[PDB]
A paper describes a structure:
The αB helix also forms a steric clash with ASF1A/B (English et al., 2006; Natsume et al., 2007), which implies that the binding of DNAJC9 and ASF1A/B to H3-H4 dimer are mutually exclusive. Moreover, the residues Gly212, Val213, Leu216, Ile220, and Gln224 of αB are bound in a consecutive channel constituted of Asp106, Leu109, Cys110, and His113 in H3.3 α2 helix; Ala127, Ile130, and Arg131 in H3.3 α3 helix; as well as Tyr98 in the H4 C terminus. Notably, Arg223 and Arg227 of αB establish prominent polar interactions with Glu105 and Asp106 in H3.3 α2 helix. Furthermore, the residues Met231, Phe234, Leu235, Met238, and Tyr242 of αB are bound into another consecutive channel constituted of Ala87, Ala91, Glu94, and Ala95 of H3.3 α2 helix, as well as Ala83, Met84, Val87, Leu90, and Lys91 of H4 α3 helix. Interestingly, DNAJC9 HBD αB has a similar structural configuration to the αA helix of CENPA-specific chaperone HJURP (Hu et al., 2011), though they share no significant sequence similarity.
Author numbering:
A (entry chain A): 57 to 134
B (entry chain H): 212 to 244
C (entry chain C): 68 to 125
D (entry chain B): 23 to 98
The structure:
């Protein structure tokens, strides 16, 4: 069962909490939450791959927040 | 060096964008009119 | 220092929890009503609004 | 409603392992929650904007598809 990344129920409740700050009384299609979860997990896994490469370039095995920040800057995020 | 690190991440990001394009096309094929 | 991701006890991260491993009905659309796809002009109007929103945010 | 805590430490470890990471600093957990928060805020804001312009109250799979298309052009 190494297919598991973020559990579905907490992810769904996270999405709905965030959405409330933009519009009240929304419902979601099940596939809308699923697509958001797929995109979020693909984003985070890829960021961890890139972060890992940054750490390795720094001759380290332990990734640190500065590795995440460097990866995001190389990726053009911020 | 840093140039190699930069090229590898940018190359991965290009592939990831194509994977996302493909995923969104599959979503359109299933859910779009 | 850090924390080893591959080591004794890693199986504790991979338990199955049926109560959390599926979306719950609350907050989901249950009737296929009022879910019509964006028309071309509604998508364009949203994207014009978001384009102006982003430009103002800088 | 503190649902950011649903991004658990095991979930973060599962994601890091899938990315090939072997060791993490303790500050990685909060950094990851913060990165996911802004990512989700950005995509959901666009998705709900499509929903509003469709004049309905249900976020559809296609609303999210268009928000993810837009994010691919603006996030980086």
């Amino acid at each position: 069962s190494t297919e598991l990344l973020i559990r579905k129920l907490p992810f769904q409740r996270l999405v709905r909490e965030i959405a409330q700050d933009f519009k009240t009384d929304l419902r979601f299609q099940s596939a809308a939450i699923g697509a958001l979860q797929e995109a979020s997990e693909a984003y985070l896994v890829g960021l961890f791959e890139d972060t890992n490469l940054c750490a390795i370039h720094a001759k380290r095995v332990t990734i640190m927040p500065k590795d995440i920040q460097l990866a995001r800057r190389i990726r053009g995020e911020r | 060096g840093v140039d190699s690190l930069k090229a590898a991440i940018q190359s991965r990001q290009k592939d990831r964008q194509k994977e996302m394009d493909n995923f969104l096309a599959q979503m359109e094929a299933k859910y779009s009119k | 220092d850090g924390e080893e991701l591959i080591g004794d006890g890693m199986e504790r991260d991979y338990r199955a929890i049926p109560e959390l491993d599926a979306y719950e009905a609350e907050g989901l659309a249950l009737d296929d009503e009022d879910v019509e796809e964006l028309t071309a002009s509604q998508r364009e109007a949203a994207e014009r609004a978001m384009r102006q929103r982003d430009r103002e945010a800088g | 409603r503190d649902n950011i805590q649903g991004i658990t430490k095991p979930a973060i470890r599962r994601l890091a392992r899938r990315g090939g990471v072997k060791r993490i600093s303790g500050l990685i957990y909060e950094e990851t929650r913060g990165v996911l928060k802004v990512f989700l805020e950005n995509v959901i804001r666009d998705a709900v904007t499509y929903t509003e312009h469709a004049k309905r109250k249900t976020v559809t799979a296609m609303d999210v598809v268009y928000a993810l298309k837009r994010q691919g052009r603006t996030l980086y």
